[PDB]
Each structure stands twice: as structure tokens, then as C-alpha cells.
Write a protein that binds this ligand. Structure first.
Ligand SMILES: O=C(C1=C(O)C(=O)N(c2ccc(Cl)c(C(=O)O)c2)[C@H]1c1cc(Br)cs1)c1ccccc1
Length: 123
């Protein structure tokens, strides 16, 4: 059986750059996928989207829209010390958190900083 780490590696292998908002979305998809025993269907949807000719980015988004655990779901909260703990390539994708952010609308996660600051990662 494919592990969360295996899936993360598979997905990373298709992404350009590193530490981009899409890599973080891979992280979220794998975490929530593991927690809901849905890694297989997520991998199947990913591969099927690639096989149809979708970009890998679009494949990840498609997973957020097609796998029910992400449908109308709030973004996960991820506790960090500071903004420096966020990958450089994610920095310009950080935004104030709106009311009711949703993963399937592009809100990948919410970072909670130690001093109380919160930043949403938007795709
Ligand atoms: O995305 C991050 C994750 C890890 O360091 C890590 O081990 N992550 C991770 C990914 C997949 C799994 Cl399956 C797990 C796990 O089971 O603990 C953890 C990342 C997380 C995703 C979510 Br949602 C909460 S934590 C992260 C990124 C920047 C700063 C801190 C954490």
C-alpha cells in the first residue's frame, strides 16, 4: 500500500520549483488523506487527471474538488513559530485569513504563528 510519504514523493516528482504553494497543497492532501484513509483514491484521481492531460497543479486542484473529504472543507491549521518556517516560494501566496476559507476554493491551509498571527495560503 502507498504511504503518505510515497504519495507526497510521487506528487512532488511532477511539480516544478520547490516549496511552492502546490507542494504545500500536496502536504495537506497527504495529511488529510492519511487521516481519512483516502490515500488510494487520492492517488488514483491524481494519476487519472494526469493521464487525461491535465497539468499536475490542475490535478491537485481537481483532487480538492473531487475527493469528498476536501469538499466544502475548512483549511487545516498548521502551527509554526514564524513566517520564516514557511517556504520562500510560498511567501507571496500568504494572505490575511478571510471568513470561512475553503480548501476547494484555494485556501490550502492556515498557518498559525506563535505570537498569534494567522496567514492563509492561497492558490
Ligand atoms: O506541511 C507541513 C507538514 C510537516 O512538516 C509534516 O510532517 N507534515 C505531514 C504531512 C503528512 C502527514 Cl501524513 C503528516 C503526519 O502524519 O504527521 C505530517 C506536514 C503537515 C500537513 C498538515 Br495539514 C499538518 S502538518 C509543514 C509545513 C511548513 C511548516 C510546518 C509544517
Amino acid at each position: 500500500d502507498i504511504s503518505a510519504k510515497d504519495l507526497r514523493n510521487i506528487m512532488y516528482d511532477h511539480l516544478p520549483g520547490f516549496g511552492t504553494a502546490f507542494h504545500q497543497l500536496v502536504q495537506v492532501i497527504c495529511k488529510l488523506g492519511k487521516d481519512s484513509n483516502s490515500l488510494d483514491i487520492i492517488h488514483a484521481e491524481f494519476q487519472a487527471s494526469l493521464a487525461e492531460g491535465d497539468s499536475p497543479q490542475c490535478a491537485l486542484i481537481q483532487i480538492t474538488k473531487r475527493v469528498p473529504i476536501f469538499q466544502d472543507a475548512a483549511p487545516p491549521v498548521i502551527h509554526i513559530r514564524s513566517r520564516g518556517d514557511i517556504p520562500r516560494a510560498c511567501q507571496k501566496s500568504l494572505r490575511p485569513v478571510p471568513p470561512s476559507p475553503k480548501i476547494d476554493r484555494g485556501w490550502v491551509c492556515v498557518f498559525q504563528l506563535q505570537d498569534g498571527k494567522t496567514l492563509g495560503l492561497k492558490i
